[PDB]
């Protein structure tokens, strides 16, 4: 999330201050963290269940 | 031994997906016509860039947090204690070895 | 610093594989030799 | 030969620490070869050279 705000939005933040900027940026990290963390809850709930 | 394995698997898929999604984002840029045989050496560093600080240190918490239970002990430390010191030093080298 | 240890480890891909075998074999040796018991760790 | 009730038999000789050391060296010579290669591959890295 530090690099999501450090992305293109960063160079824009001190000027744009846009809601549509952190939206697509936090949406950017979203798809990223779920990709792995979705398979973590799996190996745990289906691992510590037995 | 059934707990650590559950706290090891988490990061054990982190330095995997961060790399699998770091490659699909490279294979998505360059022209697929002619390829090279160096990619499997830069995908290393790519995953290393922002997973080393994250995971290594993050699971470097599971130790100092698993220590409190280790500090109190007359029987409980041989109980839930050995289960603490294990996954830690493991992660330390087994994360760079996992990322390898 | 944390990065460098990951960098030189990127290299020496052969040694790390061996250092993993010396560790896997050293672990397979102790996982057996070490005292196994259903004995709930003593008391007093 | 039937062992009269109330006795037993035990076997021990010069092979007490013989079968031990012997068999145990077969658990060291690989370790030493695996450390031999680690030192040769350390200064040459050419597998066929070691």
Tokens encoding B64 = 């100092």
C 15-34 → B contacts, CB under 8 A: 16, 20
Q: A48: Cβ–Cβ under 8 A, 6 or more apart, which residues?
A: B2, B6
B1 touches chain A (CB under 8 A): no
The gap between the terminal CA atoms of chain C, to the nearest Å, is: 46
C22 touches chain D (CB under 8 A): yes
Determine the Cα–Cα distance for residues C10 and C16; give it in Å rounded to an integer: 9
Which residue of B lies nearest to A50 if distances are taken between CA atoms?
B2
Question: How was it solved?
Answer: X-ray
Judge residue B79's burial from the number of C-beta atoms within 10 Å of its C-beta, 0-12 exposed, 13-18 middle, 19 or more buried: middle
Determine the Cα–Cα distance for residues C25 and B83; give it in Å rounded to an integer: 21
Mark yes or no for CB contact B17/A39 under 8 Å.
yes
Least Cα separation, residue B10 to chain C (angstroms): 20
The closest CB to that of B96, out of C6, C41, C43, belongs to C6
Q: What is the resolution of this structure in A?
A: 3.7
State CA C22 to chain mean position distance: 8
Let me know: does B92 contact B60? Beta carbons within 8 Å: yes
Judge residue D49's burial from the number of C-beta atoms within 10 Å of its C-beta, 0-12 exposed, 13-18 middle, 19 or more buried: exposed
């Amino acid at each position: 999330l530090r690099h999501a705000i450090e992305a293109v939005p960063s160079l824009n933040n001190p000027q744009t201050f846009s809601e549509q900027k952190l939206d697509e940026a936090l949406y950017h990290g979203a798809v990223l963290r779920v990709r792995p963390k979705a398979m973590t809850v799996a190996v745990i709930i289906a691992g510590l269940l037995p | 031994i059934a707990i650590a394995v559950g706290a090891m698997v988490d990061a054990a898929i982190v330095m995997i997906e961060n790399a699998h999604k770091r490659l699909e984002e490279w294979q998505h840029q360059h022209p697929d016509a002619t390829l090279d045989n160096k990619t499997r050496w830069q995908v290393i560093t790519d995953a290393s860039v922002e997973v080393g600080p994250a995971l290594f240190i993050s699971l470097l918490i599971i130790t100092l947090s698993f220590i409190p239970i280790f500090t109190l002990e007359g029987q409980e430390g041989r109980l839930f204690g050995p289960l603490a010191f294990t996954k830690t030093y493991a992660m330390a080298g087994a994360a760079l070895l996992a990322i390898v | 610093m944390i990065e460098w240890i990951i960098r030189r480890s990127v290299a020496n891909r052969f040694l790390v594989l061996m250092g993993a075998l010396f560790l896997s074999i050293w672990g397979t040796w102790t996982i057996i030799n070490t005292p196994v018991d259903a004995l709930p760790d003593l008391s007093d | 030969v039937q062992l009269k009730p109330g006795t037993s038999v035990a076997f021990s000789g010069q092979f007490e620490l013989l079968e031990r050391a012997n068999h145990k060296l077969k658990l060291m010579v690989p370790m030493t070869l695996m450390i031999i290669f680690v030192l040769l591959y350390l200064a040459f890295r050419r597998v066929g050279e070691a």
